[PDB]
Every structure is written in C-alpha cells, then in structure tokens.
Amino acid sequence: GYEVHHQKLVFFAEXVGSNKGAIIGLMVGGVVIA
Amino acid sequence: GYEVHHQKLVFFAEXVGSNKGAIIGLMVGGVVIA
Amino acid sequence: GYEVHHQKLVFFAEXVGSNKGAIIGLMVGGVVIA
Amino acid sequence: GYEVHHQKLVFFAEXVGSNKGAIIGLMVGGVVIA
Amino acid sequence: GYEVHHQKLVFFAEXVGSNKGAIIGLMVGGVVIA
Amino acid sequence: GYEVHHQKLVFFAEXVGSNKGAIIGLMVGGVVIA
Amino acid sequence: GYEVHHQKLVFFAEXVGSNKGAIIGLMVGGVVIA
Amino acid sequence: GYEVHHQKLVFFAEXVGSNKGAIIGLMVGGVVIA
Amino acid sequence: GYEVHHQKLVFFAEXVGSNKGAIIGLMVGGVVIA
Amino acid sequence: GYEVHHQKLVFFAEXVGSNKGAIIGLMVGGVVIA
Amino acid sequence: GYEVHHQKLVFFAEXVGSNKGAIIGLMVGGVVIA
Amino acid sequence: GYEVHHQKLVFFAEXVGSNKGAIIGLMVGGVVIA
Incomplete structure (x- = not known):
C-alpha cells in the first residue's frame, strides 16, 4: 500500500x-521495460 | 507499505x-528493465 | 516500511x-536492471 | 524500516x-544490477 | 532500522x-552488482 | 540500527x-559487488 | 538597453x-525601496 | 547595455x-535600498 | 556592456x-544600499 | 566589458x-554599501 | 575587460x-564598503 | 584584462x-573597504 x-x-x-x-514526471507504481 | x-x-x-x-523525476515503486 | x-x-x-x-531524480523502492 | x-x-x-x-539522485531502497 | x-x-x-x-548521490539501502 | x-x-x-x-556520494547500508 | x-x-x-x-522571481529593471 | x-x-x-x-531570484538592473 | x-x-x-x-540569486547590475 | x-x-x-x-549568489557588477 | x-x-x-x-558566492566586479 | x-x-x-x-567565495575585481 502506497501513500x-x-x-x-x-x-x-x-x-x-x-x-x-x-x-514521467511523477510515478507511483511499477515500470516494466523490455 | 510506502509513505x-x-x-x-x-x-x-x-x-x-x-x-x-x-x-522519471519522482518514482515510488519498483523498476524492471530488461 | 519506508517513510x-x-x-x-x-x-x-x-x-x-x-x-x-x-x-531518476528521487526513487523510493527497488530497481532491477538486466 | 527506513526513515x-x-x-x-x-x-x-x-x-x-x-x-x-x-x-539516481536520491534512492531509498534496494538496487540489483545484472 | 535506518534513520x-x-x-x-x-x-x-x-x-x-x-x-x-x-x-547515486544519496542512497539508503543495499546495493547488489553482478 | 543506523542513525x-x-x-x-x-x-x-x-x-x-x-x-x-x-x-555514490553518501551511502547508508550494505554494498555487494561481484 | 537590456536584452x-x-x-x-x-x-x-x-x-x-x-x-x-x-x-520577485525574475525582474528586469530598477528597484527603489524606502 | 546588458545581455x-x-x-x-x-x-x-x-x-x-x-x-x-x-x-529576487534573477535581477538585471539596479537596486537602491534606503 | 555586460554579457x-x-x-x-x-x-x-x-x-x-x-x-x-x-x-538575490543572480544579479547583473549595480547595488546601492544605504 | 564583462563576459x-x-x-x-x-x-x-x-x-x-x-x-x-x-x-547574493552570483553578481556581475558593482556593489556600494554605506 | 573581464572574462x-x-x-x-x-x-x-x-x-x-x-x-x-x-x-556573495561569485562576484565579477568592484566592491565598495563604507 | 582578467581571464x-x-x-x-x-x-x-x-x-x-x-x-x-x-x-566572498570567488571574486574577480577590486575590493575597497573603508
């Protein structure tokens, strides 16, 4: 849980x-780059 | 849990x-780069 | 738990x-680079 | 727990x-580089 | 616990x-490099 | 516990x-290099 | 002449x-303060 | 002449x-303070 | 002439x-303080 | 002439x-303080 | 002429x-203090 | 001429x-103090 x-x-x-x-300026989550 | x-x-x-x-400027999470 | x-x-x-x-400027989490 | x-x-x-x-400028977490 | x-x-x-x-400029955590 | x-x-x-x-400029944690 | x-x-x-x-953030001119 | x-x-x-x-953040000119 | x-x-x-x-952060000119 | x-x-x-x-952080000019 | x-x-x-x-952090010019 | x-x-x-x-941290010019 992120806050x-x-x-x-x-x-x-x-x-x-x-x-x-x-x-991205602000990111709250996961990043997957292939 | 992140805050x-x-x-x-x-x-x-x-x-x-x-x-x-x-x-990314600000990131709260995981990064996966292949 | 991060704060x-x-x-x-x-x-x-x-x-x-x-x-x-x-x-990334500011990151709170994990980084995985292959 | 990090603060x-x-x-x-x-x-x-x-x-x-x-x-x-x-x-990365500021990082709070783990780094894994392969 | 880090502070x-x-x-x-x-x-x-x-x-x-x-x-x-x-x-990395400032890091609070672990680093694993292969 | 680090402070x-x-x-x-x-x-x-x-x-x-x-x-x-x-x-790394400032690091508070462990470093593992293979 | 300013440019x-x-x-x-x-x-x-x-x-x-x-x-x-x-x-003032950005000023091009004179300032007089009494 | 300023440039x-x-x-x-x-x-x-x-x-x-x-x-x-x-x-003032950025100023191009004169400043007079009494 | 300033450049x-x-x-x-x-x-x-x-x-x-x-x-x-x-x-002042950045100033290009004269300063007079009384 | 300043450059x-x-x-x-x-x-x-x-x-x-x-x-x-x-x-002042950066100044290019004259300073007069009374 | 300054450069x-x-x-x-x-x-x-x-x-x-x-x-x-x-x-002053960086100054290119003259300073007069009374 | 300064360089x-x-x-x-x-x-x-x-x-x-x-x-x-x-x-002053760095100065290129003259200083007059009374």
Whole structure:
C-alpha cells in the first residue's frame, strides 16, 4: 500500500527525439521495460 | 507499505535523443528493465 | 516500511543520448536492471 | 524500516551517452544490477 | 532500522560515457552488482 | 540500527568512462559487488 | 538597453508573513525601496 | 547595455517573516535600498 | 556592456526573519544600499 | 566589458536574521554599501 | 575587460545574524564598503 | 584584462554574527573597504 502526497514537482524537457521509453514526471507504481 | 510526502522536486533535462529507458523525476515503486 | 519526507531535490541533466537505463531524480523502492 | 527526511540534494549531470545503468539522485531502497 | 536526515548533498558529474553501474548521490539501502 | 544526520557532502566527478561499479556520494547500508 | 531571454526560473516560497517589500522571481529593471 | 540569456535558476525560500527588502531570484538592473 | 549567459544557479534559503536588504540569486547590475 | 558564462552555482543559507546587507549568489557588477 | 567562465561554486552559510555587509558566492566586479 | 576559468570552489561558513565586511567565495575585481 502506497501513500504519496504533498509533492511540488517541476519537470523541464528539451529535445526529445525518437523517444521509445517512459518520460514521467511523477510515478507511483511499477515500470516494466523490455 | 510506502509513505512519501513533502517533496519539492525540480527536474532539468536537455538533449534526450533516442531514449529507450525510464527518465522519471519522482518514482515510488519498483523498476524492471530488461 | 519506508517513510520518506521533506526533500528538496534539484536534478540537472545534459546530453542524454540513447539512454537505455533509469535516470531518476528521487526513487523510493527497488530497481532491477538486466 | 527506513526513515529518511530533510534532504537538500542537487544533482548535476553532463554528457550521459548510452547509459545502461541507474543514475539516481536520491534512492531509498534496494538496487540489483545484472 | 535506518534513520537518515538533515543532508545537504551536491553532486557534480562530467563525462559519463557508457555507464553500466549505479551513479547515486544519496542512497539508503543495499546495493547488489553482478 | 543506523542513525546518520547533519551531513554536508560535495561530490565532484570528472571523466567517468564505462563505469561498471557504484559511484555514490553518501551511502547508508550494505554494498555487494561481484 | 537590456536584452534578457531564455530563462528557466523556479521559485519556491514558504511562510511569507507580513511582507512589506518586493518578492520577485525574475525582474528586469530598477528597484527603489524606502 | 546588458545581455543576459540561458539561465536555469531555482530559488528555495523558507520562513520569510516581516520582509522589508528585496528577495529576487534573477535581477538585471539596479537596486537602491534606503 | 555586460554579457552573462549559461548559468545553472540553485539558491537555498532558510529562516529569513525581518530582512531589510537584498537577497538575490543572480544579479547583473549595480547595488546601492544605504 | 564583462563576459561571464558557464557557471554552476549552489548557494546554501541558514538562519538569516535581520539581514541589512546584500546576500547574493552570483553578481556581475558593482556593489556600494554605506 | 573581464572574462570569467567554467566555475563550479558551492557556498555553505550557517548562522548569519544581523549581516550588514556583502555575502556573495561569485562576484565579477568592484566592491565598495563604507 | 582578467581571464579566469575552470574553478571548483567550495565555501563553508559557520557562525557569521554581525558581519560588516565582504565574505566572498570567488571574486574577480577590486575590493575597497573603508
């Protein structure tokens, strides 16, 4: 059981060519990349 | 059981060519990369 | 049981070509890389 | 049981070509790299 | 049981070519590298 | 039981080619390298 | 003649009681405080 | 003639009671305080 | 003639009671305090 | 003529009571304090 | 003519009571204190 | 003509009561104190 709160997140991204993965600011869970 | 709170995160990214993985600012969980 | 709070994180990234792993600012959990 | 709080982390990264591992600013947990 | 608090960490990285391990600013946990 | 607090750590890194181990600024835990 | 461009500014403020001055993120000009 | 560009500024402020001056992240100009 | 560029500034402030001066992260110009 | 570029500045401040002067991270110019 | 570049400055400050002067991380210019 | 580059400066300060002068990490210029 996850409990996430009170986050102030700022995400800057520049030049994202041909992205094939995950670009995530805030994530609460699992990540599976093959 | 996770309990995450009160985060002030700033993420700067520059030149992200052909990303095939995970680029995450804040993550609460598991990561599996093959 | 994890308890993470009160973080002020700043992440600078420059020139991320062909990333195939995990680039994470703040992570609370497990990481598995094959 | 982990208890992490009150962190002021600044992360500078320059020239990250073909990263295949984990580049993490703050991590609270386990890391497994094969 | 770990209790980590009140850290002011600054991390400078330059020229990270073909990283296959873990480059972590602050870590509270275990590391397993094969 | 570990109790770590009040750290002011500055980490400079230059020229990190083909890193296959752990490059960590502050670590509180165990390290296993094969 | 001023020429200001290409700024990525993030401003965090906490607990601003009875402010009587100037709290400015980005300013291009003059400031006079009596 | 001023020429300011390409700035990545992050400003953290905590506990600003009864401020009577100038609290500025980025300023390009003159400051006069009496 | 000033020419300022390519700055990555991070400013941490804690406990700023009764400030009567200038608290500035990045400044390009003159400062006069009486 | 000033030419300032490529700066990575981190500024930590703690306990700033009754400041009457200038607390500046990066400054390019003149300072006059009476 | 000044030419300043490629600086990695980290500034730690603790207990700054009743400051009446200049506390500057990086400065390129003149300072006059009366 | 000054030419200053490639500096890695770390500045620690503790207990700065009633400062009336200049406390500077890196300075390129002149200082006049009366």
